[model samples]
Target: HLPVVGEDYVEIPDGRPFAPLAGKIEVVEIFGYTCPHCAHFDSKLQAWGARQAKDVRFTLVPAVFGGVWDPFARAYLAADVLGVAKRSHTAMFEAIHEKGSVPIQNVGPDELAVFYAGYGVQPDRFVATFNGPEVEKRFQAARAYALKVRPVGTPTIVVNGRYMVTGHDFEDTLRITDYLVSRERAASHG
Candidate 1:
């Protein structure tokens, strides 16, 4: 009752659990690094993610709406598979948006290779993995999952990939996410 549907969240007509990590209550944020809104929401989102219980799995899926989005998503996938995602995640957002170090578009793989080097991965390996087929497949997989979830835009939160959380603003957004996460938490108590 706390998070009534259609208000706090909208039900996807064919919503289903997305990419279960240990079958937990998956909280996935569909975001784009180039989007300023997602960067603005990052701090709050991180705090909220940190507060979630162990049963709740908070993850991020970079959006691929076209143009440089695909490249950014590819870079993220590469970072993820190479084991630098956790360290480099916020850096990507900060680089393009807050710091203005990296361009949102036309940024070469070598440029990102240098960027990722600070996180411990080798430049050559980072580029290789970034351009690798495995990461391409992973990116395509995220794209397909995004199609099913169907985020209206960047910085959208899909609770368990079923209810698309909404709010009046960023604060309200996570408030609703908290309520929905709590709902899922209780439901899966078994």
Candidate 2:
């Protein structure tokens, strides 16, 4: 049995990593770029992940809840492959929420390509990657993983696929995740 880390997290019923752990304790974030709550939590989580020990891995899996979430999810798939997902994270959110340069809904591959092009990839290549065979598989994998975790909302946090963290605010979320990660590290003899 796990130590008490109350209220902020719940145990997953049939918990397991979505894919291979590859020998790291993954602190996974199930996010949606079009999700405002996720946008709000971005920087803090980034800072938190940056300071973690080497064994604590970080992951960002998209929430393809359909509608406007589609283009952003595709954008993530493509940008991650192109190696700019990190650089473009804040900018993507700001364009939609802060700058209002992009719509929250009705966005397309072409429009998203222009946005991601600012990160150095060409529009054509970005679009190709978006519609390519790669994202398709990743898309399904992410969706499948999400279905298993069954998060009730965006910005869900899973601690090594063992717990589904619940929280009142972004700050609370990370704090709880920190506890979970620390617990894992202790269990692993860190």
Candidate 3:
């Protein structure tokens, strides 16, 4: 499942215009909330992150492709700022897809407050960070990095900032991640 170098994989620079990984291995999952594939992958990604080894770091990079996706990018960053991403990532995805909710569009600050309050985040803090300059910058930076990776679609995974896995099936993606992890481990030891 290893992606060919220079085609599906490319090097992410040290720092400029990209966020570098600090650990031995870093896994980044590029996703959009409105994407059905991403919606399904959300829980899987969460479980993977929870079980990932100490040497492996996991990051969720929300894509900003406009429309329903824009607010999701904002919400994702807000969750990161609130430090509630672990508990709220799947909740936000479910809130929109399963509950028929559109808090992004219909809910303004008040609605956003109530929504984040459900996740135990202070409403005022969520409201402020949701529209804060730092959050906006993070979202923009994430979008730029996502574009640099040239993800064909959502549910795409990049391992150690080098391998990209965009398989159609969940099993395929997991296999790819396992392969990448093994490769990384071997390389480190060698």
User: Global lDDT of each model?
Assistant: 0.85, 0.84, 0.73
lDDT of 3 at 4: 52
Higher lDDT: candidate 2 or 3?
A: 2
RMSD of 2: 2.3
Name the Cα RMSD for model 1: 1.8
Q: Residues 1-190, candidate 2, lDDT per residue (tens digit)?
A: 2335457798887888766677677888999888889999999889998998898888998987778776788788889988999999999989988999878778888888888878899998998899998998888888888888888888999988888789879888888888888887888784
**Leading candidate by TM-score:** 2
Q: TM-score of each candidate?
A: 0.92, 0.93, 0.83
* Model 3 steric clash total: 0
Which wins on TM-score, candidate 2 or candidate 3?
2
Candidate 2: misplaced stretches above 4 Å?
Answer: 1-6
lDDT measured at residue 174 in model 2 versus the true structure, 0 to 100 = 81
lDDT of 1 by residue, 47-133 (tens): 999988888888889897789888888888899899998787788889998788889869889889989989888999998999899
In model 3, which residue pairs have backbone atoms overlapping below 3 Å? none
Q: Report lDDT (Cα) of residue 150, candidate 3.
A: 68
